[PDB]
Ligand binder design. Structure first.
Ligand code: BDW
Length: 390
């Protein structure tokens, strides 16, 4: 591991997000910031909110610069609005550099901040094309790379605990690593396999085959990427296009048929519980997503376990049972490889070479019989046809 200063710099969990400490302004104001590979704005709470115990105070920063422009960002289940400006930004457990970056000072929001998440802002790590108000507002990572010698690449190791963490525990536990400018070899086992970034807006990739316990879902592969497939640390679940979700759930139900679960469990709404230590991992199937490789007609696969797609949650009765929610859900906006999938792997966002790498994570949860995997190569033809075009 050559990046010790950045190893173990994340905290959090899949359901509320993983965050990194950052500082903004002069003198530095410390804030915890959500790592979000699914957006491209650096936006921080800048006014009192019931769920924030701190926020960015522009009037206290000598280096604050007002851009005299507002920004409104509505999204699926909420929105955030703010005032744009720039200031000096640093990451204490990151590269030892300070850069001048755009900051959206959030003045109003709806269903954005999460009670008990411990973060006060978000770091959009995707490309300018999806930055708001438009692509002229340079994203943080672009600024970092342009102003310093930091390589144009970052990598993420999100570590799920495999069991519920109470408030004190989640504040004291290490949730993973965000390595800025490099790859730390202590964070993964086996080899790294790369898939091309299809287009630079979201971190878009192409899935070419899907298996449930080795059985091919056998759908037209364009269905797997309708209308896109992205890697998003800001989403909790593995989200799949409606038809793919329906096919996958049918296959997962068939594989786990020795136990019957209520419809609410499969809808990802209700938890299922087992007596302490008796979770029947073995009856649930592994899921393999084959991704386009860097070589023509070549693919590789990433395989996750139920220890990744069953999200630990505390029982309504705080009992001693081990409980979980099904963390695979349907989408009308494409496939989303959320945090529960990322928890199985060390993911390298190699912006410089327009590719995303995957390797088995040194902190993935598993049992004595099965482990997550990243394997290849496999001969796969006409993979370009798996991409969807409007
Ligand atoms: C952290 C875990 C939270 C829960 C909520 N939750 C549902 C959910 C639904 C959609 C998205 C996609 N997504 C995203 N990655 N960032 C934003 C802006 C996208 C951006 C794209 C370009 C155009 C402008 C908006 C803001 C979010 C970021 C997370 C905090 C809330 C606001 C967004 O909507 C993520 C999560 C989930 O699963 N776990």
């Amino acid at each position: 591991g050559s990046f010790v200063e950045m190893v173990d710099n994340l905290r959090g969990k899949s359901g509320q997000g993983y965050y990194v400490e950052m500082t903004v302004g002069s003198p530095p104001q410390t804030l915890n910031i959500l790592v979000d590979t699914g957006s491209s704005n650096f936006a921080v709470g800048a006014a009192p909110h019931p769920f924030l115990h701190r926020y960015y105070q522009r009037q206290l920063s000598s280096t604050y610069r007002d851009l005299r422009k507002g920004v409104y960002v509505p999204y699926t289940q909420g929105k955030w609005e703010g005032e744009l400006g720039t200031d000096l930004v640093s990451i204490p457990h990151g590269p030892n550099v300070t850069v001048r970056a755009n900051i959206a000072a959030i003045t109003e929001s709806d269903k954005f901040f999460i009670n008990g998440s411990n973060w006060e802002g978000i770091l959009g790590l995707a490309y300018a094309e999806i930055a708001r108000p438009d692509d002229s507002l340079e994203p943080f990572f672009d600024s970092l790379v342009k102003q310093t010698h930091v390589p144009n690449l970052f990598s993420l190791q999100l570590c799920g605990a495999g069991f519920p963490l109470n408030q004190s525990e989640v504040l004291a536990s290490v949730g993973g690593s965000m390595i800025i400018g490099g790859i730390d070899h202590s964070l993964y086992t086996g080899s790294l396999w790369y898939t091309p970034i299809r287009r630079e807006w979201y971190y878009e990739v192409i899935i070419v085959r899907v298996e449930i316990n080795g059985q091919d879902l056998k759908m037209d592969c364009k269905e797997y990427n309708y209308d896109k497939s992205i890697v998003d640390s800001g989403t909790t679940n593995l989200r799949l296009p409606k038809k793919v979700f329906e096919a996958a759930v049918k296959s997962i139900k068939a594989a786990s048929s020795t136990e019957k679960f209520p419809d609410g469990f499969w809808l990802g709404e209700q938890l299922v519980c087992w007596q302490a230590g008796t979770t029947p991992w073995n009856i649930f199937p592994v899921i393999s997503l084959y991704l386009m490789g860097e070589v023509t007609n070549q693919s590789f696969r990433i395989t996750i376990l139920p220890q990744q797609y069953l999200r630990p949650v505390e029982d309504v009765a705080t009992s001693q049972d081990d409980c979980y929610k099904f963390a695979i859900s349907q989408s009308s906006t494409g496939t989303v490889m959320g945090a529960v999938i990322m928890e199985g792997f060390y993911v390298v966002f190699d912006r410089a070479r327009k590719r995303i790498g995957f390797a088995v994570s040194a902190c993935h949860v598993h049992d004595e019989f099965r482990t997550a995997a990243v394997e290849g190569p496999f001969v796969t033809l006409d993979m370009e046809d798996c991409g969807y075009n409007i």
